């Protein structure tokens, strides 16, 4: 049932708005999707697999959007171009705050969640490194740090800063200031001597 699986995922994202995964039971997901507990278990082996699927969907949505942008870059200056790409993650994770938050909490306890996050961060960092490489090859960025190490810290910064902001952690940058903040630190560190 494409619909029954989707109903489960929809309920899980809705419930995660209100509590952590530890406080949502399989019976809760089933009730919300209009199904029995054993029917639930035909579609997912555990409420953890539900979170893993929700996170996979969000990570691929962000990845697909970055691939589109990479094929269709904005015709504007460097700063606004980097803003556009960082915005892909700001708007994609920011429209799925509860999934994002729960997926991060899970990295500690779930090998598959951890792996899924790893895989995509590796990809995103390799792409950032290749852009910085191209920028250096064009003579637009100086050859300062190793591009992949610079890319790794800047992507890590974005991961921690975006997610603190969407969780309203203390300390955090306000959500309405976070793009400006990250784009400044990316531009100054990639183009600065």
Ligand X SMILES: CC(C)[C@H](N)C(=O)N1CCC(c2nc(-c3cccs3)no2)CC1
Q: By CB under 6 A, name the binding residues for ligand X.
A: 69-70, 73, 78, 81-82, 84-86, 89, 124, 127-128, 131, 135, 155, 158
Reference 114, options 144, 122, 79, 32; nearest CA is 122
Is the Cβ–Cβ distance between 128 and 69 less than 8 Å?
no
When CB distances to ligand X are compared, the closest residue is 85
Contact between 37 and a second copy per CB under 8 A? no
Instruction: Decide whether 25 or 118 has the Cβ nearer to a second copy.
Output: 118
What SS3 class is residue 25?
coil
What SS3 class is residue 170?
coil
Give the integer Cα–Cα distance in Å for 38 and 83. Answer: 46
- Which of a second copy, ligand X, none is residue 10 near (CB under 5 to 8 Å by kind)? none
- Which of a second copy, ligand X, none is residue 69 near (CB under 5 to 8 Å by kind)? ligand X
Give the integer Cα–Cα distance in Å for 88 and 57. Answer: 15
Instruction: Decide whether 25 or 80 has the Cβ nearer to ligand X.
Output: 80
CA distances from 118 to 38, 39, 121, 124, 161 (A): 32, 32, 5, 10, 17
Is the Cβ–Cβ distance between 34 and 3 less than 8 Å?
no
Q: In the complex, what is the shortest distance from the CB of residue 179 to ligand X, in angstroms, rounded to a whole number?
A: 11
Contact between 45 and a second copy per CB under 8 A? no
Contact between 156 and a second copy per CB under 8 A? yes
- Which of ligand X, a second copy, none is residue 73 near (CB under 5 to 8 Å by kind)? ligand X
Is the Cβ–Cβ distance between 86 and 92 less than 8 Å?
no
Q: Which of residues 98-127 bind a second copy (CB under 8 A)?
A: 105, 108, 118, 121-122, 125
Give the integer Cα–Cα distance in Å for 172 and 97. Answer: 15
Instruction: Decide whether 78 or 148 has the Cβ nearer to ligand X.
Output: 78
Binding site for a second copy (CB under 8 A): 105, 108, 118, 121-122, 125, 144-146, 149-150, 152-157, 159-161, 164, 169-174, 177-178, 180-182, 184-185, 188-189, 192
């Amino acid at each position: 049932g494409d619909d029954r699986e989707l109903a489960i995922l929809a309920t899980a994202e809705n419930l995660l708005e209100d509590r952590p995964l530890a406080d949502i039971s399989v019976d809760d997901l089933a009730k919300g999707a209009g199904i029995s507990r054993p029917t639930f278990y035909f579609y997912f082996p555990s409420k953890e697999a539900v979170l893993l699927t929700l996170l996979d969907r969000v990570v691929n949505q962000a990845d697909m959007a970055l691939q589109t942008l990479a094929e269709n870059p904005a015709d504007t200056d460097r700063e606004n171009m980097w803003r556009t790409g960082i915005n892909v993650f700001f708007e994609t994770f920011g429209s799925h705050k509860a999934v994002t938050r729960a997926g991060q909490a899970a990295r500690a306890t779930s090998v598959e969640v951890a792996e899924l996050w790893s895989t995509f961060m590796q990809k995103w960092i390799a792409y950032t490194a290749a852009v910085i490489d191209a920028e250096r090859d064009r003579g637009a960025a100086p050859r300062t740090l190793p591009a992949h190490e610079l890319a790794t810290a800047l992507n890590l910064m974005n991961e921690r800063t975006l997610f603190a902001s969407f969780a309203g952690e203390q300390p955090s940058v306000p959500e309405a200031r976070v793009l400006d903040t990250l784009v400044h630190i990316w531009v100054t560190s990639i183009y600065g001597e």
